[PDB]
């Protein structure tokens, strides 16, 4: 069920990403407060979708990009991250670099679009 | 920065499309007016995204299509448009054909789907 993977390792947790996505879109003063809550749910949803669009990951739950991983963001074995750590733990470990990584993802997609203007079949 | 490219030529301005996309999303009477404004911003965002979907340009900032350019819409050199004009000037020059062009883009995508349904892997 929803968040049942919260204590799972990153590898195992990634097996069930759909369940975590499909659960995002489910007296005057009371009425206004409820409308505000519905609007925020929509605005936050759309913000995340826009980033996937910008980074070139639209429509995917798992997306591979060309931004290299920096050893200064985190230096662990690939097996250490995927098998002995959960997503909650990881998120805390690299929360400091979230904005750096997002910035790089945008720059990479912009370079890719520039390369597509080439017509020499990009080689 | 946002709209910093407004005075740039179309070619140069197109180098920074992401910055123009990331700036689209963010007492009873006051509360209603603000909800009015937020709902409307969402509706406009989605309307444009739906058109990109319909035209077969979903998830892209730059999209090539199969609709030929008409000399009756604007007859200028390719180098004239891209190097000696800004996007504001261009928009004014062809504002009368906006709906015509959009209509053609829609027809083009519909024909493409009809061709895909063929299965002989030929247009």
């Amino acid at each position, epitope marked *: 069920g929803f968040l049942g993977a919260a204590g799972s390792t990153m590898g195992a947790a990634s097996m069930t990403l759909t369940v975590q996505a499909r659960n995002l879109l489910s007296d005057t003063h009371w009425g206004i407060k409820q409308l505000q809550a519905r609007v925020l749910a929509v605005e936050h949803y759309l913000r995340d979708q826009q980033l996937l669009g910008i980074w070139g990951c639209s429509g995917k739950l798992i997306c591979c990009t060309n931004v290299p991983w920096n050893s200064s963001w985190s230096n662990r074995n690939l097996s250490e991250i995927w098998d002995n750590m959960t997503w909650l733990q990881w998120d805390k470990e690299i929360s400091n670099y979230t904005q750096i990584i997002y910035g790089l993802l945008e720059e990479s997609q912009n370079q890719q679009e520039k390369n597509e*203007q*080439d*017509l*020499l*079949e990009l*080689d | 920065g946002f709209l910093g490219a407004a005075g740039s030529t179309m*070619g140069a301005a197109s180098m920074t499309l992401t910055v123009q996309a990331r700036n689209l999303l963010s007492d009873t009477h006051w509360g209603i007016k603000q909800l009015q404004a937020r709902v409307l911003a969402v509706e406009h965002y989605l309307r444009d995204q739906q058109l990109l979907g319909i035209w077969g340009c979903s998830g892209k900032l730059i999209c090539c299509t199969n609709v030929p350019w008409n000399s009756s819409w604007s007859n200028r050199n*390719l*180098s004239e448009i*891209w190097d000696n004009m800004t996007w504001l000037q261009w928009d004014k020059e062809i504002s009368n054909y906006t709906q015509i062009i959009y209509g053609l883009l829609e027809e083009s995508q519909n024909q493409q789907e009809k061709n895909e349904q063929d299965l002989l892997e030929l247009d």
Partner: antibody, heavy 118, light 105 residues
Framework: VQLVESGPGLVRPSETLSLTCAVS?????????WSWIRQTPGKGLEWIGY????????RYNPSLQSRVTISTDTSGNQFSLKVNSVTAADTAKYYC?????????????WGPGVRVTV | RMTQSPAILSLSPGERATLSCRAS??????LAWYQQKPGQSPRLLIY???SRATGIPDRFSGSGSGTEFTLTISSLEPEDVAVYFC?????????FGQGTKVEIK
């Protein structure tokens, strides 16, 4: 941009054919499309291949692949073509050319060309 | 590759020439035409089947689709004698055909 070819005017089969193209008017390191084209009486024009001066990658006409290489030189702002196996059949005027093809523009620059006897 | 049909053309000064090229496979409108005057490297005249290159006289034009293309001029001038080549560019192995000669009487 201006392109000037230079190298041996005669290469024996055991020798490597080598032509270096000097580039003036821009930097190799910024553009793509730096290429070679062969012209011979039995073949009007044959494409050889090109090099990307920004990434250093190359694409060759597959028919020549087993014996061809293209590389650049930042220092002389030049680039060159080499043929690793020479045969009499490959007697030609070799041209250095620059091909610009983008969504918003097209042009070519061609050099004088050099005839090499084999 | 592609076939150039009119291997030799000979025109009275002032007459128009028509040249034609048959692709082995569709070129998907990425055909270009080149002019090679004796002793010169080829010059680009036309690209994307019918787009005229910068600096090229409006005497030159072209058309076609699929695999069937032409190169035409409005009239032949003495300065237009050259070998004219058909250049395919919709696959990596960019291919040139064997250009024909347009001679003037």
């Amino acid at each position: 941009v201006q392109l000037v070819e230079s190298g041996p005017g005669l290469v024996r089969p055991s020798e490597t054919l080598s032509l270096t193209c000097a580039v003036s008017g821009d930097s190799i390191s910024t553009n793509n499309g730096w290429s070679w084209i062969r012209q011979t009486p039995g073949k009007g024009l044959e494409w050889i291949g090109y090099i990307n001066g920004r990434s250093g990658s190359t694409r060759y006409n597959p028919s020549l692949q087993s014996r061809v290489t293209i590389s650049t030189d930042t220092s002389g702002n030049q680039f060159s073509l080499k043929v690793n196996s020479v045969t009499a059949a490959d007697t030609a005027k070799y041209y250095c050319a620059f091909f610009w093809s983008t969504y918003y523009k097209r042009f070519d620059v061609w050099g004088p060309g050099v005839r090499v006897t084999v | 590759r592609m076939t150039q049909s009119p291997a030799i053309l000979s025109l009275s000064p002032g007459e128009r020439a028509t040249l034609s090229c048959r692709a082995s496979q569709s070129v998907d409108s990425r055909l270009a035409w080149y002019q090679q005057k004796p002793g010169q490297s080829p010059r680009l005249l036309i690209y994307d089947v019918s787009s005229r290159a910068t600096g090229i006289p409006d005497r030159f034009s072209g058309s076609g689709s699929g695999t069937e293309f032409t190169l035409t001029i409005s009239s032949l001038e003495p300065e237009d004698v050259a070998v004219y080549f058909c250049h395919q560019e919709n696959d990596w192995p960019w291919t040139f055909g064997q250009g024909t000669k347009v001679e003037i009487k």
